[PDB]
């Protein structure tokens, strides 16, 4: 959820 959910969130975007 923290600074990690940006780095989850964006790998969505490298998905």
Not at 1 to 15: E, T, Y
Request: no cysteine.
């Amino acid at each position: 959820k923290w600074k990690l959910f940006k780095k989850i969130g964006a790998v969505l975007k490298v998905l």
